[PDB]
Amino acid sequence: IEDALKVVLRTSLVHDGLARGLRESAKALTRGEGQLAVLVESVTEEAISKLVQGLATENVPLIKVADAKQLGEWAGLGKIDRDGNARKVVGASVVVVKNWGADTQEREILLEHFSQQ
RNA sequence: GGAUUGACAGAUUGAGAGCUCUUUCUUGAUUUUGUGGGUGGUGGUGCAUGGCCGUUCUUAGUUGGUGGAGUGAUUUGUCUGC
Ligand SMILES: [Mg+2]
Ligand SMILES: [Mg+2]
Ligand SMILES: [Mg+2]
Ligand SMILES: [Mg+2]
Ligand SMILES: [Mg+2]
């Protein structure tokens, strides 16, 4: 669901849980750190997503949200001083949640559903 | 899918300075390059200034209010004496 994802990105931006990028994400997944991972499939040459999946096999669950630019936009990378987007382009293309922070019921039901697959 | 940061070892250096290079590794939006602007300056101007001190001047010297003399600038009061 769309709500739980923004909730978890807020709970990990507040307590510094987002591994904003792929090297930090890879290091977190290699360690016992990365508790969640959202990545976009609209990536050229597709090897980064394959590497993310392989590191995920190894901290298991992953999400497959598209729209890398939008993913970064609602991932909190923007300073977003105004109400509207005040930056030309900003993206993440991989986001890893380390610290779960505050917990909401809808989000935990969603992650349990995604774990069940 | 890296604005950037930092560095072992060597060349380089006076340096055990990752200053610069060889290679690579680390770091995460604080930054980096341009514009405006701002700071810092035992930089200049004491002949732009303050404050302070020095000196004229260690002497006894100044000043204005009513009043008098001058058209007036000024003067008397601030003096002949002791
Ligand atoms: Mg100075
Ligand atoms: Mg002077
Ligand atoms: Mg005097
Ligand atoms: Mg008179
Ligand atoms: Mg007189």
Query: How far is it, in rounded angstroms, from Cα A109 to Cα A46?
Result: 30
Nearest alpha carbon to residue A112 among A55, A36, A19:
A36
Distance A7 CA to ligand 3 centre (A): 82
* Overall number of domains in chain A: 1
Radius of gyration, alpha carbons of chain A: 14
Backbone φ, ψ for residue A49 (5° rounding):
-65, -40
**What domain range is A14 assigned to?**
1-117
- In strand B, which positions have an atom below 7 A from any protein CB? 1-2, 26-30
**Could you list the protein residues whose CB lies below 7 A from any atom in strand B?**
A 20-24, 27, 43-45, 48, 68, 79, 91-94
Q: Which nucleotide in the DNA or RNA is closest to residue A16, CA to C1'?
A: B28
Instruction: Judge contact between A99 and A10, C-beta under 8 A.
Output: no
SS3 of A113, please? helix
The enclosing domain of A33 has a CATH number of 3.30.1330.30
